[PDB]
């Protein structure tokens, strides 16, 4: 015989083992970067409510139930919630499940108690939601999860199917789990008995040098389970989140049957296109295992009478607007030397609750404005950032945030109009010896000769002038009076005002120092406006906006860490006086519709309008965040909206869709509340009006009083 044949196949097998080594002993796959939202820490004495906490939990993929049994679940009671915080690999320290009770004392979090030992936590970590993945060059997207990470039952459901009961190394006789691992991992497409035998040879070599758990650990992360546009969704972990919005470790049995059922055929059982052949395949799996010992008959009818929820969505590109900022910030910080790495973890500043509320305000708000005014193509952008740290919490780049290609929060450069006014008042108030809230500004006809040849003659909103010819600075800003603003600004000088703009953090090449700049001849994107208003909201510290918190390697190596880098930009006292006045605009000025609806928030804000309302804006500052809202048309035509009411309606819905933090303005040093009389002069005691004043010696009133 030519038995040497068993020899060149033996060497072909030994040399085959050479390939099933360099592959599995290292990078099995190029693993895409995972993008996570914010990690929230809870603390006792935190200002939050139970209903507020419920929303944060549901936004973080938690499910409210009657009785808890699994991670990612929680129960509500009269004055508290009980949850099972799911396990997560926090950069700071890996954590398992924790059964906690958060107890609420009305307005705040009273206690957080470990249900295990009945003791209190000093702070408690909530895991971050997976927002998205960063496209993998392969076109194949995976979320690696170790063996242990898979629930016993989905492994049982998996074994109850494909590899019927085991796979010890009979199946062929009657007429393979390791057999298929190589099929997807090493082999070509289809037709070949040689393929059938080539994998069969790789299967023995495989299951010879690698453990049981290691085979299905690679398998449960390799199987094709979906198609997101032109990206392969494979692996049970990523499929779970993609096909249920919940981790693999937390799938219900009926959801485990579906995924598994979709392994045989992985595209025709797709619950989107045809839910019928998927429902039958699901129930089929439910009857497959029902025969073996794992499944009861009574519960079977439940799982079968258990429709699919199922994400009923496409999710091809989650949070397109915010992800633009993320991609942009990654390039700047780490460069192109990042996607070279596999299994990278990106921790962002994204707030799921805020995003939900902004998106809802945009989606419902815009059609409402179009109906109430008979419009045809109205658009909007919303940016939310943290008051003090400049972290970007939310970004809405269009009235249809779900499906976005053009991101208006970052790309739509638009005249800010009267939103420009605080810069001027901030410039003035930064000089406490000369300009104060009670300083009188002329309000009379203006005529400014400019570079050839026409004369610039700005008018008040109502084409009227103050009967006295003058108005106090406080009231000019409150009422967004055009004429006093130009008189103030021209007296301060366009260079001084322009320098305030740079300190506030606006792009320097957008600044053109001519009179109209004072009234908003300044074109910015919403994210750039947010920077400017964050600087005044923080109390004068410019905190560069960012969407990244950290970037960790698969092994836990820190590729990037964010450190606080706020820069003192304007005096805190001037920032304060400007904000106090912006509280006036919201209570009694142009923003007064908002102060009437949310009196207890004491919001500070500024309306923005342009000639014929081409662009409308609102900038609202609460206790914790700055929200910029823009409403207008892409073609740059008049909106027909009147006043900042369009941007204030969107913002008002934003405020209603979440739980805003009251703004309680704490006065910095050397701020004193002082009375003035009707003439506007300071008085020692009394005064019909009280205004805060930057002074270390309120005895500029003994001086004022000595007029006699």
Swiss-Prot record:
Stretches the record annotates as UvrB domain 2 homolog: 38-129
Keyword Transmembrane helix: yes
Segments for region (Membrane association): 17-174
SUPFAM superfamilies found in the cross-reference section: beta-lactamase/transpeptidase-like (SSF56601), Lysozyme-like (SSF53955)
InterPro entries noted in UniProt: Beta-lactam/transpept-like, Glyco_trans_51, Glycosyltr_51/Transpeptidase, Lysozyme-like_dom_sf, PBP1b_TM, PBP_1b, PBP_transglycosylase, PCN-bd_Tpept
Any one biological process term the GO annotation gives: positive regulation of bipolar cell growth
Transmembrane segments: 1-16
Membrane topology: Single-pass type II membrane protein
Keyword Nuclease: no
Region annotation (Transglycosylase) ranges: 124-276
Key words of the record: Antibiotic resistance, Carboxypeptidase, Cell inner membrane, Cell membrane, Cell shape, Cell wall biogenesis/degradation, Glycosyltransferase, Hydrolase, Membrane, Multifunctional enzyme, Peptidoglycan synthesis, Protease, Signal-anchor, Transferase, Transmembrane, Transmembrane helix
Taxonomy, superkingdom: Bacteria
Catalytic function, reaction form: [GlcNAc-(1->4)-Mur2Ac(oyl-L-Ala-gamma-D-Glu-L-Lys-D-Ala-D-Ala)](n)-di-trans,octa-cis-undecaprenyl diphosphate + beta-D-GlcNAc-(1->4)-Mur2Ac(oyl-L-Ala-gamma-D-Glu-L-Lys-D-Ala-D-Ala)-di-trans,octa-cis-undecaprenyl diphosphate = [GlcNAc-(1->4)-Mur2Ac(oyl-L-Ala-gamma-D-Glu-L-Lys-D-Ala-D-Ala)](n+1)-di-trans,octa-cis-undecaprenyl diphosphate + di-trans,octa-cis-undecaprenyl diphosphate + H(+); Preferential cleavage: (Ac)2-L-Lys-D-Ala-|-D-Ala. Also transpeptidation of peptidyl-alanyl moieties that are N-acyl substituents of D-alanine
Family matches, as PANTHER family: BINDING PROTEIN TRANSPEPTIDASE, PUTATIVE-RELATED (PTHR32282), PENICILLIN-BINDING PROTEIN 1B (PTHR32282:SF11)
Subunit (UniProt): Forms a trimeric complex with MipA and MltA. Has also been shown to exist as monomer or homodimer; homodimer of Alpha and Gamma isozymes can be found. Interacts with UvrA, FtsL and FtsN.
Role: Cell wall formation. Synthesis of cross-linked peptidoglycan from the lipid intermediates. The enzyme has a penicillin-insensitive transglycosylase N-terminal domain (formation of linear glycan strands) and a penicillin-sensitive transpeptidase C-terminal domain (cross-linking of the peptide subunits).
Protein known as: Penicillin-binding protein 1B
